[PDB]
Amino acid sequence: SDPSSINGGIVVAMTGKDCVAIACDLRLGSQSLGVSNKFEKIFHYGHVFLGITGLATDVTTLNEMFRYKTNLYKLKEERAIEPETFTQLVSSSLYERRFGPYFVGPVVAGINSKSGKPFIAGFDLIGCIDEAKDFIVSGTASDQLFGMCESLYEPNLEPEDLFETISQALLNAADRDALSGWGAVVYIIKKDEVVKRYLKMRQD
C-alpha cells in the first residue's frame, strides 16, 4: 500500500579523500515476492552518478527523464553537467510534481571536474536537498544504514578503504531488511577512473 516500500531496495553514498562511493542492492520485489536480482538502482550521466530508491516504475521513469534532460543540457551547454548543477535539476524536477510526487529517494554522487571536489547529496520525494559532507542513505533500510554509517564512517578514507566501509555498511544493513538484498553493487569514483564491483552476499 505504501508506495515507497512495495519494491524495496537501498542506496548509500560516501565521500573519501579525492573520491566518492555510491552503492545499492539489486532486489526488486512485489512486497514479499522477490521478482528480480538484477535491478540496478545507480545510473550515470557523464561523470555524475544518481542512485534512486523507492517505487520501481518511478525509478525507471526518472532515470529516463534525467538522461533526457542531461542530454539536452550537454548539446546546449557544450559540456557535461556537474554534480552541484545536477543536484539542483533533480530538486527542481521533483518539486514540479509537488502535489503528485514521484515516490523515490534519490542520491547524487560525483566529483566536480574543474575543482576536483568530492560531492554527495540526498533528496526526499519532493525535492528537499540534504547535502551532507560524510554520507547519504536511502531506501527501506535507511534506519539500518544510518546506524552502520554513523559508526563505521571516518573522514578522508582512501578509495580502497572507502570501498570496504561502504560495502560493509550496505551488506549488514540489507541483511536486517526483508525487502533489500539479493546482490549489491559498489561504485568507487575518482576524478578520471570509476571502478564497479559486484558483492557476494546471502540470497534470502
Binding site: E64, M65, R67, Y68, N71, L72, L75
Partner: protein, 244 residues
C-alpha cells in the same frame, strides 16, 4: 478589417507553385555553400561562413554546423535564427524517441519529422515559411551512413553527395564528376574542400571562412564519433589537401 494586410503566405500561383517557398529558396541561394559527402567509412560536412571579419571570434562561433545528437548532425544554409528554432525542435524529438523506445532515433525518422514541420507552414497558419535548407549527416544501425537534405517546402531526399546554398549548380556538377561509390572519408574530405575552393565567391578559401565536420566509425570499435573541427584543425586539413 485585417484581411487587407494579409500577404496570404500559403497559396498556389497559377502555375501551381508556392510563392513563399520559391522566394525562400531564392533567399537560400545567397547563403554560404554547404556540402555533404557520404563515404563507406563515414560522412563529411563542409560549409563556408559568409563574408567574415578579422574581429569575429571564430573558435566560439557556430553558424553552419550543428549537433542534433551523438549520431546526427546538420549543415545549415539560410536564416541562422530560423534554423536554430528547428534545430532545438529536432533535438527534443530525438530525446522523446530515446525516452519512448530506449533506442537512438533512426536518421530518416528525425528528418521526416523536421520536414513535416516545414510542410505545415506552407499549408496552414498563414505564417511565412522557414528560410532554411538542411543537410543531415547521420548514422543508425539500419541503413548505416546517410545523407539527407530538406528545404522550406518540407520535401526531403537522400544523397551520396549534395550541396545547398550558393552555387549549387556548379558545386553539384563538380561533385558528380569526381564522386565514386568506393570512396573513403579522407578522399571525401579532399573533394569537399576542392569543390568549395572552386565554387566560392571569395578570392581564396582560408580556415577562418570554413566550418568542417566528420562522422566516422573511426571511433574505437563498434561505435560512431562526431568531430566538429577546430579552427586550427581546419587550417591543418587545408594544408594537408594542398589548398593553402
Amino acid at each position: 478589417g485585417s484581411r487587407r494586410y494579409d500577404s496570404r503566405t500559403t497559396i498556389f500561383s497559377p502555375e501551381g507553385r508556392l510563392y513563399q517557398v520559391e522566394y525562400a529558396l531564392e533567399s537560400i541561394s545567397h547563403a554560404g555553400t554547404a556540402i555533404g559527402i557520404m563515404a563507406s567509412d563515414g560522412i563529411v560536412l563542409a560549409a563556408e561562413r559568409k563574408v567574415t571579419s578579422t574581429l569575429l571570434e571564430q573558435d566560439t562561433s557556430t553558424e553552419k554546423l550543428y549537433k542534433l545528437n551523438d549520431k546526427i548532425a546538420v549543415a545549415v544554409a539560410g536564416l541562422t535564427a530560423d534554423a536554430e528554432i528547428l534545430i532545438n525542435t529536432a533535438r527534443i524529438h530525438a530525446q522523446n524517441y530515446l525516452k519512448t523506445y530506449n533506442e537512438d532515433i533512426p536518421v530518416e525518422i528525425l528528418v521526416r519529422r523536421l520536414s513535416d514541420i516545414k510542410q505545415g507552414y506552407t499549408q496552414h497558419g498563414g505564417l511565412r515559411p522557414f528560410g532554411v535548407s538542411f543537410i543531415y549527416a547521420g548514422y543508425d544501425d539500419r541503413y548505416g551512413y546517410q545523407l539527407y537534405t530538406s528545404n522550406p517546402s518540407g520535401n526531403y531526399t537522400g544523397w551520396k553527395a549534395i550541396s545547398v546554398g550558393a552555387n549549387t549548380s556548379a558545386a553539384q556538377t563538380l561533385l558528380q564528376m569526381d564522386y565514386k561509390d568506393d570512396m573513403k572519408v579522407d578522399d571525401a574530405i579532399e573533394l569537399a574542400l576542392k569543390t568549395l575552393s572552386k565554387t566560392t565567391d571569395s578570392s581564396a578559401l582560408t580556415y577562418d571562412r570554413l566550418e568542417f565536420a566528420t562522422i566516422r566509425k573511426g571511433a574505437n570499435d563498434g561505435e560512431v564519433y562526431q568531430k566538429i573541427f577546430k579552427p586550427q584543425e581546419i587550417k591543418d586539413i587545408l594544408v594537408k589537401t594542398g589548398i593553402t
